[PDB]
DNA sequence: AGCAATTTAAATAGGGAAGATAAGCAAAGGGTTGACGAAAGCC
């Protein structure tokens, strides 16, 4: 399910972003979506405390 | 005690043999490099 999911990650801290400092320094933590550069084809990252959430029947 | 001459021509061709093989092993390791969240003494 995907409704599921996303509010799996809301229960969580739950942050989308296209761009983060957290690539540069694990410790920290800033994570900046932003609007502009999403298109077709934009690959979009997302942050959870320790990587939470559940997984669906394909182990995604 | 330096003086030692000039041109001219330097071979055309025919051949550079194929048949064989070119090992099989067994190794090639992991030891550290984790930040948030949550109890839990402690100024």
Do not use: Q, W
């Not at 999911?5 to 801290?13: A, H, N, R, W």
């Amino acid at each position: 399910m995907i409704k599921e999911m996303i509010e799996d990650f809301i229960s969580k801290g739950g942050l989308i972003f296209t761009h983060s400092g957290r690539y540069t320094n694990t410790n920290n933590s800033c994570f900046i979506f932003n609007k502009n550069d999403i298109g077709v084809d934009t690959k979009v990252d997302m942050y959870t405390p320790k990587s939470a959430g559940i997984k669906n029947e394909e182990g995604e």
